[PDB]
Design a protein around this ligand. Sequence first.
Ligand code: ZN
Length: 490
Amino acid sequence: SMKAQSIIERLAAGQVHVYPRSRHESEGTRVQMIKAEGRKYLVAEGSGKLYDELRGEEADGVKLCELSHENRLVLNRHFPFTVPQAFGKQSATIGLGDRLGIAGPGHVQTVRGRAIHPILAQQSIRELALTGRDYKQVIDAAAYAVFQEGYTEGYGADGDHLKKEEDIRMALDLGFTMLTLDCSEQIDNEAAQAGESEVKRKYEELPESVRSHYEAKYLDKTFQVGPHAIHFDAATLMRDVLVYREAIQFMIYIYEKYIQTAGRAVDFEISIDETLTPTAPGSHFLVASELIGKNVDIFSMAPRFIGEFQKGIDYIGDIAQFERELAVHAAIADRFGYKLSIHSGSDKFSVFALVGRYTNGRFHVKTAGTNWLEAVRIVAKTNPGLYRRMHQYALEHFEEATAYYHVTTNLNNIRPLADVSDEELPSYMNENDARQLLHITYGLLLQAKKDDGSSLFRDEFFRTLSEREEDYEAALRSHIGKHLDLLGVK
Ligand SMILES: [Zn+2]
C-alpha cells in the first residue's frame, strides 16, 4: 500500500510512464495503463461500476490494479474490443504466438494500419506444458495488449494443435475463437509409404459401403479446379482413402460434437501439417470434398507442403515444385471457400510472395517461436553474459528438445562461444543452426532452475526484456513487418 501510494503520487507528479493509447472510459470511470518499477498496472479513477469491479489498491480517489486475470475479465465486460472474436474465411489473418506473454503490444503495433487481422493469443498444448503457462494467461496477454495500444479492430484467439477432446472443451470454455484440430495421429502414414498391391489389399478390407461411396464419387473421374484437372484412378483413390479416411471421420466427429454446437462463431482449422508424408494436392481435394459434403464449416486447411518447413529457418526444397503444388492447393481452397494455412511460417521468406499471390492475399500464416528468438536477440545485444549462459545451456541440453521438434540442425556449424566476442553474439540469431538451437530449447531454458529451486535464467531474462521493452517492440515491428511486407499485406 505504501508501494501503491508511491506510484500514485509519482503518477500525479508526472514521473510515471503512461501508455498514451491506453486511455479508455466506461460510464464515469477513466482507466489507463502505466509502467512503474518494471511492472505494468491499470489506473482507474472516477466513480462507476468499472471502478468498483476492478481489484486494486486505492489512494486519493485512484485505484492501482495489477494486470490480473480477474481484472481482464472486468475489462472484457466493459470493453468488448478486448474480447477475442472470430473472423470468418474471407480475409487475411496472421497467428502471432507469444511464448512469453510480452510480445502483444509489439504485435499490435505491427498490424496497426495493415489489412490483416491478428490472432494475438495462440499457443499449443506443448508450448503451455514446456513454459508452465495456461490458456487464461495467453488470452490475458492479448487482451491487455489491445487495451494498451487502443487497438479496437478486433483480435483472435487460437487453440493451436489441439488433439484431445478435453483440450477442445477447455479452449471453447475459455473463449477461444479459432480451434486448430491436429489430425496427424489419425493419418495412416504406413499406408502412404506401402507398396501398391498392399494398398489394394488393405483397401479391400474396408466395408463395401465405404468402397462404393468413394468409387462412385471419385473413381476414374476428373474434377476441374480452375485451370487444374484432378483425376483419380484406382491406385491413387485407394491410397488416399487408406491414408486419410480415419482422419476425415475424426474431423467430422469433432465438428459435429464441438464446433457446430458451440453457440457462437468459431473458426475451425484442420491441421495435417505434422505428417511424415506431404499432402498431395489430389489428396487435399478428396479430404476437402468429403468434409464439405458432410456440411463441415472450415476456416482453413493446413497441409504438409512438399519440402520442409522447419522452425527458425527458410524453406528447404525446390521452390519451383513448391510453387506448382501451391497453385493447385490454393485453387482447391478457393473452390471450397476456406483458406490455406501455413504452419511453421515464420522466417519462410522464400515462400511469402508466392503464398500472397496464389491466395490473392486470403491466407492464414502462423508464427510463435520467432517472437521468442527476437527476445533472445535482445538478450544477446544487451545482456551478453546472460546470452552466453543460455546458449551454452541450450547446447548442453539440445538432445532433449529435438525429441519435441523435428530439426536437422548441424551443431558443427555453430561457432564456439569462446570464439565470439560480446559484440558478435547477436550474429548467432542470423544463422540457421544457432537459431534452431535457441528456438527449440525455449521450454528447457525458461523452466531451468538452480539447486535451490530458483530460476536459472527466467527471472533475469524477463528483467532484461522489461528494461529493453522499447527495443523488443522495435524488433518485432521490423521482423514481423518484413513478414507482412513479403506476404503482400496492404
Ligand atoms: Zn502445425
